[PDB]
Amino acid sequence: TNEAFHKVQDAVNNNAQALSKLASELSNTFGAISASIGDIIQRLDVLEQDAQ
Amino acid sequence: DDCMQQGPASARDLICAQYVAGYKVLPPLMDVNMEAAYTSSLLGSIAGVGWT
Amino acid sequence: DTKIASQLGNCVEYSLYGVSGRGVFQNCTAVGVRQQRFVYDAYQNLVGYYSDDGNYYCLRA
Amino acid sequence: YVDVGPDSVKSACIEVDIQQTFFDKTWPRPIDVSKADGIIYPQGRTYSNITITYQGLFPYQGDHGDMYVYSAGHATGTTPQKLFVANYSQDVKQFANGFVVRIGAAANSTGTVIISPSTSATIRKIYPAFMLGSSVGNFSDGKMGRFFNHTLVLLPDGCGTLLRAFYCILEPRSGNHCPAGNSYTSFATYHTPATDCSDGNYNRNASLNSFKEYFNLRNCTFMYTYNITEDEILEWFGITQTAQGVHLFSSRYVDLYGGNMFQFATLPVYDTIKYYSIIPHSIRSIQSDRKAWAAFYVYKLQPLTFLLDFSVDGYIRRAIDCGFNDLSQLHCSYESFDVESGVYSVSSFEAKPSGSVVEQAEDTKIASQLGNCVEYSLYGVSGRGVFQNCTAVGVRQQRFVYDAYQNLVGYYSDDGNYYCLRACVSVPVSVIYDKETKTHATLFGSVACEHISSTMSQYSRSTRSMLKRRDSTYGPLQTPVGCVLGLVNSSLFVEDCKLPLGQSLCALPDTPS
Amino acid sequence: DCKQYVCNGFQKCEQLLREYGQFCSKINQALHGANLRQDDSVRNLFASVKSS
Ligand SMILES: *[C@@H]1O[C@H](CO)[C@@H](O[C@@H]2O[C@H](CO)[C@@H](O[C@@H]3O[C@H](CO[C@H]4O[C@H](CO)[C@@H](O)[C@H](O)[C@@H]4O)[C@@H](O)[C@H](O[C@H]4O[C@H](CO)[C@@H](O)[C@H](O)[C@@H]4O)[C@@H]3O)[C@H](O)[C@H]2NC(C)=O)[C@H](O)[C@H]1NC(C)=O
Ligand SMILES: *[C@@H]1O[C@H](CO)[C@@H](O[C@@H]2O[C@H](CO)[C@@H](O[C@@H]3O[C@H](CO)[C@@H](O)[C@H](O)[C@@H]3O)[C@H](O)[C@H]2NC(C)=O)[C@H](O)[C@H]1NC(C)=O
Ligand SMILES: *[C@@H]1O[C@H](CO)[C@@H](O[C@@H]2O[C@H](CO)[C@@H](O)[C@H](O)[C@H]2NC(C)=O)[C@H](O)[C@H]1NC(C)=O
Ligand SMILES: *[C@@H]1O[C@H](CO)[C@@H](O[C@@H]2O[C@H](CO)[C@@H](O)[C@H](O)[C@H]2NC(C)=O)[C@H](O)[C@H]1NC(C)=O
Ligand SMILES: *[C@@H]1O[C@H](CO)[C@@H](O)[C@H](O)[C@H]1NC(C)=O
Ligand SMILES: *[C@@H]1O[C@H](CO)[C@@H](O)[C@H](O)[C@H]1NC(C)=O
Ligand SMILES: *[C@@H]1O[C@H](CO)[C@@H](O)[C@H](O)[C@H]1NC(C)=O
Ligand SMILES: *[C@@H]1O[C@H](CO)[C@@H](O)[C@H](O)[C@H]1NC(C)=O
Ligand SMILES: *[C@@H]1O[C@H](CO)[C@@H](O)[C@H](O)[C@H]1NC(C)=O
Ligand SMILES: *[C@@H]1O[C@H](CO)[C@@H](O)[C@H](O)[C@H]1NC(C)=O
Numbered sequence: 164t165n166e167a168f169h170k171v172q173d174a175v176n177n178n179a180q181a182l183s184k185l186a187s188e189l190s191n192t193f194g195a196i197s198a199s200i201g202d203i204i205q206r207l208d209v210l211e212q213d214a215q
Numbered sequence: 216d217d218c219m220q221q222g223p224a225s226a227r228d229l230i231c232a233q234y235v236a237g238y239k240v241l242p243p244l245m246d247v248n249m250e251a252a253y254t255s256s257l258l259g260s261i262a263g264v265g266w267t
Numbered sequence: 268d269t270k271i272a273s274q275l276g277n278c279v280e281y282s283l284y285g286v287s288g289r290g291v292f293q294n295c296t297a298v299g300v301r302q303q304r305f306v307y308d309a310y311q312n313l314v315g316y317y318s319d320d321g322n323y324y325c326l327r328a
Numbered sequence: 329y330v331d332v333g334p335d336s337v338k339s340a341c342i343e344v345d346i347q348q349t350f351f352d353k354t355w356p357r358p359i360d361v362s363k364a365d366g367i368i369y370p371q372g373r374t375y376s377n378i379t380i381t382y383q384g385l386f387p388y389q390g391d392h393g394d395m396y397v398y399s400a401g402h403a404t405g406t407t408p409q410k411l412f413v414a415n416y417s418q419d420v421k422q423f424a425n426g427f428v429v430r431i432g433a434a435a436n437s438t439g440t441v442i443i444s445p446s447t448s449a450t451i452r453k454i455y456p457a458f459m460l461g462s463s464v465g466n467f468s469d470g471k472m473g474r475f476f477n478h479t480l481v482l483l484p485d486g487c488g489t490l491l492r493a494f495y496c497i498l499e500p501r502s503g504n505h506c507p508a509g510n511s512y513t514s515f516a517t518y519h520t521p522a523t524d525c526s527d528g529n530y531n532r533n534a535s536l537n538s539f540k541e542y543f544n545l546r547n548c549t550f551m552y553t554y555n556i557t558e559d560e561i562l563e564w565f566g567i568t569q570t571a572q573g574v575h576l577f578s579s580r581y582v583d584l585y586g587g588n589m590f591q592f593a594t595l596p597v598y599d600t601i602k603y604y605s606i607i608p609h610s611i612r613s614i615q616s617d618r619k620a621w622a623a624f625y626v627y628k629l630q631p632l633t634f635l636l637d638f639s640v641d642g643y644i645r646r647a648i649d650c651g652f653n654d655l656s657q658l659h660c661s662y663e664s665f666d667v668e669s670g671v672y673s674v675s676s677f678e679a680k681p682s683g684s685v686v687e688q689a690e691d692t693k694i695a696s697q698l699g700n701c702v703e704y705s706l707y708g709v710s711g712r713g714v715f716q717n718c719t720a721v722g723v724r725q726q727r728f729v730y731d732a733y734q735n736l737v738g739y740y741s742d743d744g745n746y747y748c749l750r751a752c753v754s755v756p757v758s759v760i761y762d763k764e765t766k767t768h769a770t771l772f773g774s775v776a777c778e779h780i781s782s783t784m785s786q787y788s789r790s791t792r793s794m795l796k797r798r799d800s801t802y803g804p805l806q807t808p809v810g811c812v813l814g815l816v817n818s819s820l821f822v823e824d825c826k827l828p829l830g831q832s833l834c835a836l837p838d839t840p841s
Numbered sequence: 842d843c844k845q846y847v848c849n850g851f852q853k854c855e856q857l858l859r860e861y862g863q864f865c866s867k868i869n870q871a872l873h874g875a876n877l878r879q880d881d882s883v884r885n886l887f888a889s890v891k892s893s
């Protein structure tokens with residue numbers, strides 16, 4: 164309930180989200196069939212894998 | 216060691232995830248003991264700011 | 268052809284019921300849901316698996 | 329084909345007395361997703377210790393369910409007589425993506441034995457029977473609910489101790505009271521507990537054999553039996569169809585004392601199920617052995633987005649039906665409710681469209697309709713909106729005037745009039761939410777209270793019931809910030825409500841008891 | 842109100858928009874934060890203006 168305290172907590176939260184976002188993007192597809200190279204290779208023929 | 220199989224199975228640190236992400240968290244510049252030395256120097260500077 | 272049921276461990280390639288990847292398995296306690304075999308994390312990565320030997324392994328990649 | 333045993337040799341069927349008024353009871357047993365009722369565990373993987381948002385096949389919050397009542401047949405008090413059923417066989421519903429059922433909802437309660445309304449008995453769980461298929465039509469005597477070719481029948485038997493799932497051509501028998509004979513009403517299945525529910529020896533074929541009195545089983549492609557542990561435990565069960573077959577789901581084998589439904593079996597039915605109905609059922613008990621049965625409830629599944637709360641044991645113990653109300657849409661987007669304030673903008677009220685206006689030289693009156701929000705087509709120009717009689721702006725004789733954003737401003741009609749187009753108007757909404765008292769009030773902003781009522785037909789969300797609890801007794805109160813329901817005029821001055829409305833206004837939370 | 846902003850009441854749009862729902866969640870929450878900062882700034886400034 165202390166505004167200065169809350170700001171301290173946000174400095175921490177702001178750094179936490181900067182990494183959480185880089186980390187969660189590793190599982191995000193980008194119009195791709197999969198965010199996983201291993202799964203792209205395993206279930207797709209080579210001519211399609213490069214596009215994914 | 217705590218992100219390795221030779222450690223507690225319960226570790227879920229976002230730091231452990233860095234070994235896969237290719238991300239690294241860097242250490243702080245001062246350490247707690249030097250920061251404490253700098254503010255203990257301020258405490259010893261109290262009494263006082265008068266006498267010009 | 269043997270023994271490839273499990274190998275604990277360091278960094279082993281794997282294929283489990285169509286699920287693929289590479290990593291180290293650790294003998295650990297179960298987290299749920301039971302009987303659904305493959306447990307995933309907040310980032311949709313595999314956390315661990317219930318094997319046909321009755322054991323649950325944690326995956327640390 | 330599959331040998332499913334011999335045909336019945338009975339020359340006639342049991343007469344079925346269909347008396348729907350006796351089954352016309354009210355006892356809704358709705359799905360409450362906050363406890364994850366009706367939630368089918370997501371397939372292909374598991375999670376634990378997490379709240380996620382997921383789009384998939386789920387029942388919706390507040391669905392009361394279609395109530396299916398099974399009952400004792402007629403009896404002399406010494407022997408059973410005719411069957412006594414609800415008109416369920418003709419109640420053909422769309423299968424679509426599947427449905428779920430709540431089984432034994434009234435189990436262990438005491439209530440009517442149905443056939444004799446003044447008589448009550450302890451209520452028992454009974455498993456539902458279904459008839460499903462890709463095509464339906466009429467019977468040769470004009471009755472409805474005929475399924476064609478191979479029909480999927482889900483027929484519990486053995487007094488609820490086995491499920492018979494089968495797919496056969498049902499060949500109607502011609503004897504008295506049979507589907508192709510004299511005085512047919514509806515086929516119904518039955519069992520006779522006096523001989524069929526003997527302890528240690530249930531007649532595992534009692535309902536199959538009664539079914540067989542009405543239809544012969546032909547060219548069966550399958551018949552599978554599943555065993556059922558007999559208990560009175562509230563149970564989730566359900567069905568879906570995919571490209572891989574028909575999926576039978578239950579909480580019975582994985583979460584018996586919980587309710588998350590899991591798949592337990594798949595049937596090889598590749599003919600898309602389009603239609604289904606409940607098989608009526610009657611128990612040939614005697615008056616001294618007349619029991620009460622729990623109704624089962626059928627709720628539909630549809631592709632819905634839910635927040636699903638997975639405990640450490642991986643079971644869903646809570647869910648949020650994101651579109652149920654305005655606050656719930658916010659909870660899904662914001663994860664929870666005490667997150668910050670709960671004071672956020674919410675989804676707006678759409679408009680509610682009216683019949684169209686059409687004009688084009690190249691059924692009445694559609695020349696114009698002034699007005700509110702009407703669909704239109706004018707010389708190839710389409711849209712929806714309200715027309716206003718107004719002065720002309722140019723250029724004359726070019727018919728359609730557009731604005732700075734290339735939107736239609738107005739049109740010169742063939743009646744000589746020029747109308748201004750305002751498209752449709754809508755009602756913006758915001759919610760004032762208190763995470764401490766778990767209460768709220770709402771604003772319509774600029775709409776003003778002359779257009780506000782406690783009920784709405786616009787609409788912005790499926791239900792407004794959380795506000796109605798208090799707002800149903802108040803008119804809207806008009807303020808400089810906007811029109812608000814649930815405001816209460818107190819004439820107070822406070823420094824900070826933690827719900828300021830801006831300007832010089834504040835929404836003050838009440839005090840906890 | 843992203844659902845309305847992106848498309849003016851069309852179901853086909855909403856069906857495709859749904860695939861992107863997480864985007865608009867970020868938009869509204871980011872603006873929520875900015876509007877709160879605006880209010881805190883205004884009240885904190887006037888608080889210094891007022892005399893006892
Ligand atoms: C309750 O209702 C169920 C319905 O499932 C009955 O289960 C059926 O029981 C009948 C016998 O009563 C079974 O039919 C017989 O099966 C014998 C062997 O079965 C295996 O091999 C056959 C080969 O065709 C497969 O079809 C079957 O699935 C099994 O793999 C056969 O040797 C028998 O043949 C003899 O009788 C037939 C006529 O029925 C003659 O044509 C033959 O020449 C020969 O004389 C016969 O086919 C049937 O398979 C079971 N069905 C299912 C789906 O399991 C229960 O028995 C019944 N219970 C009670 C108490 O009534
Ligand atoms: C009708 O009455 C019956 C009989 O009491 C109710 O069945 C009982 O329901 C409770 C609650 O789930 C069961 O308790 C469970 O016990 C297991 C044991 O390990 C525990 O792990 C669970 O967490 C839970 O405590 C109880 O066992 C069960 N009785 C039987 C015989 O299994 C039934 O639920 C009532 N039905 C309705 C519709 O009210
Ligand atoms: C499914 O069943 C229907 C009816 O039981 C079959 O349609 C009949 O086909 C005969 C062919 O001469 C017609 O004379 C009947 O009038 C048709 N009846 C109806 C209701 O259409 C249909 O062909 C069967 N389909 C399969 C795949 O067996
Ligand atoms: C089970 O399959 C048999 C064929 O294997 C069906 O017999 C045919 O039925 C059609 C119906 O119009 C007749 O036109 C054919 O002449 C019949 N063939 C023979 C060899 O008789 C049989 O009807 C199927 N069972 C059911 C109940 O439909
Ligand atoms: C290791 O495997 C044994 C097998 O019985 C199991 O009981 C034990 O709990 C496992 N270790 C952990 C940390 O769970
Ligand atoms: C069944 O018969 C009734 C008689 O009026 C008719 O109205 C109905 O459309 C028929 N249904 C089918 C599927 O033919
Ligand atoms: C059900 O249990 C009985 C017990 O004897 C067994 O014979 C029968 O095969 C079982 N059926 C199923 C479907 O498990
Ligand atoms: C859930 O998260 C908490 C966080 O402290 C952790 O301690 C607990 O072991 C976790 N449980 C599971 C099943 O992961
Ligand atoms: C309303 O319609 C009449 C038709 O004669 C027109 O004269 C009048 O100007 C219209 N209203 C406005 C605001 O132009
Ligand atoms: C509240 O009551 C006072 C009484 O003078 C009135 O002036 C004020 O406009 C009322 N406000 C609302 C929103 O009804």
